[PDB]
Write a protein that binds this ligand. Sequence first.
Ligand code: ZN
Ligand code: ZN
Ligand code: ZN
Lengths: 211, 216
Amino acid sequence: EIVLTQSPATLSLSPGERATLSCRASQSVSSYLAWYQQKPGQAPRLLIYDASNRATGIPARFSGSGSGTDFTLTISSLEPEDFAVYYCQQRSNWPITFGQGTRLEIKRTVAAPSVFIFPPSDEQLKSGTASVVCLLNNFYPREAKVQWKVDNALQSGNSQESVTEQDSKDSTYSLSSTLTLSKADYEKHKVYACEVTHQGLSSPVTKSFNR
Amino acid sequence: EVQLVESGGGLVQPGRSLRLSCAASGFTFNDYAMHWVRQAPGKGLEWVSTISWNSGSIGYADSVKGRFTISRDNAKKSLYLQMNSLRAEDTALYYCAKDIQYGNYYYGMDVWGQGTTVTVSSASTKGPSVFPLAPGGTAALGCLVKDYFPEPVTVSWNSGALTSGVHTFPAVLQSSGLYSLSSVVTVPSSSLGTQTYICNVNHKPSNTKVDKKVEP
Ligand SMILES: [Zn+2]
Ligand SMILES: [Zn+2]
Ligand SMILES: [Zn+2]
């Protein structure tokens, strides 16, 4: 098959700035290179076909260029609706293949998260499991370090985190971190703490409860 | 209106079969090449199959050959996919898509459906448990939606009357093979004694609706 490599994987830019997205093929695809936009929850949208032709109704700020193996989608002055994932697709050769995408994210001023910790419920503890949840609300950039401490000892391997899509109103993120223990283990400890490290925080914020 | 509408997705075990339909209206279906394209949760697009307007030319993805059969009915403006001996890694959202190609070499998928989700698993469907994340200026509260299979679960707050400040997080696949998500909302602390907060959880695959009131 023809492999298409997209770079960069992620791109952070402000509205009004220019976006330059690269697609490179493992062998020539001539001009048979299309570009797609895809928002979360939504089907893909054709932007460009034949390397450089805009699909019907696509704003003029979208332009494609290239031939052979090296292609570029340029968005000359970014709009808020332009922040999405972008895929290239070749139509030269069986099988039809796609790049793995470039995620285009809104660059925003730094915003520190507000942090909340939740103990497990009494309803859950009867089932023999304890989920401790830590919430970071409305922060930018996406990069955050959230660590769990139990009786002040840093935890490892026993939590998972999940992040929302960029907010359509304020361009921030929200994040959950979930600490999972057995009820038994949970009841052996005294203090449960979520320590959060972020560019918007001069020093780490810690939220805790005593079981 | 120009529409493509797919259906037939479902949860089936490995080795079993599914038939997908893609019903078109509002454009000349018989003029165009049609495609099936699939997308795994969190992943990129992967082409499955293609059929020309006259059904005389057909293409298949490599992982799919000998197992999947594409077909169309121009008079019914419908496109089909017979999927045989299904595997876990066939799990995806399946799209049908119309090409712009018309007597030329211009290639582009300009009209897409919404997708039908196919889940291939040995694991039986299981409804969630719903636990409160109780509130401790601005407060936060939520619901933990734990141990369900398969995706999706949907969450609303106060039967849809609360939307501002809500964050319903992408599910996580736990080592148990079961999914978990939290849904949160931040609220003014002042309203905690006065305002009622209920999360409405729905898990269609198990017919589960749960309303959990979340309190101090
Ligand atoms: Zn190859
Ligand atoms: Zn605009
Ligand atoms: Zn928020």
